[PDB]
Amino acid sequence: GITRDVQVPDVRGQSSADAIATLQNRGFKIRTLQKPDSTIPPDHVIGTDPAANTSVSAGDEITVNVSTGPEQREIPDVSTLTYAEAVKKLTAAGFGRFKQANSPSTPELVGKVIGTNPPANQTSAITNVVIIIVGSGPATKDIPDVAGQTVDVAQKNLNVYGFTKFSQASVDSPRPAGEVTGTNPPAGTTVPVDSVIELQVSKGNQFVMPDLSGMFWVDAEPRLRALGWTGMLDKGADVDAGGSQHNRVVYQNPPAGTGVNRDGIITLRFGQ
């Protein structure tokens, strides 16, 4: 006959709080089901389940249908070199709306994704499109080790790398003239190909002078002139000192057999 089960008053059409409050007061329990987006029944009670409207035992669980606000996704982080995973991630994020832009960038960002133009840690809508920019187009390269090679070879190596602008600075060195001492920037330094690279060149500024010891100046003179000597000649006073000194070279300031300065300055003396 009459059910000892109790029919539970419904209060749908108001709010979740009021509905739950009524049931909770009576000792009933509820189950709340959330669904993302408000295109489906809002979090406020518009409808309920007739379980409560039926005679049930006091202390049952009534299901309430709730929806949560608009769906947005926070953008997952991905390795910049892994564009495939990046696009995958936007796709797995719902929207899957992405653009790929290439921009000439600083050498370190070239070759990989730099990020997204909109904030990549923040939320984007499922209808929102994210433009992703990848660094492309380098005009920078790292200069190789170039020391011990000739200037001609050095400039050639630099030109091969695309460094068309070079300048060579020659400084005196024990190292022979022509050997590249090194470069202004060290090896491995990434620089623009359109930059002017400085090749520092060893300048020996020395050439070996042949023996002229104990000979006559009548021999010394044509020999020096013949070898293309052009410097400063020290001819002092003519001194009659005897046979040992007659037109004989007394000493040669730069020792025979070694390298003499680029000037070639020879100090020699003869008597008369």
Place of tokens 């433009």: 131
Query: Residue 268's Cα: distance from chain center in Å?
Result: 61
Reference 94, options 76, 106, 110, 112; nearest CA is: 76
The one-letter amino acid at 191: V
DSSP designation for 111: T
Joined tokens for residue 168: 């060579």
Reference 35, options 66, 63, 74; nearest CA is: 66
- Go through 42-71 and write b for each residue having 16 or more CB atoms within 10 A of its CB, e for each that does not: ebebeebeeebeeebeeebebebbbbeeee
What whole-number distance in Å separates Cα of residue 260 and Cα of residue 113? 60
> Long-range contacts made by residues 143-146, C-beta under 8 angstroms, separation at least 24?
143/183, 143/185, 143/187, 143/188, 143/189, 143/191, 143/197, 144/187, 145/187, 146/180, 146/182, 146/183, 146/187, 146/199
What whole-number distance in Å separates Cα of residue 62 and Cα of residue 31? 6
- Go through 101-129 and write b for each residue having 16 or more CB atoms within 10 A of its CB, e for each that does not: eeeebeeebbebbbbbeeebeeebeeebe
**Alpha-carbon Rg for the chain in angstroms:** 47
Residue 80, helix vs strand vs coil: coil
Reference 254, options 216, 224, 222; nearest CA is: 224
What whole-number distance in Å separates Cα of residue 174 and Cα of residue 23? 100
Handedness of CA 214, 216, 217, 221 (dihedral sign): negative
Please name each of the domains of the chain with its CATH number.
1-70 (3.30.10.20), 71-138 (3.30.10.20), 139-204 (3.30.10.20), 205-272 (3.30.10.20)
Place of tokens 């518009």: 46
What whole-number distance in Å separates Cα of residue 125 and Cα of residue 117? 15
> Long-range contacts made by residues 87-90, C-beta under 8 angstroms, separation at least 24?
87/132, 90/130
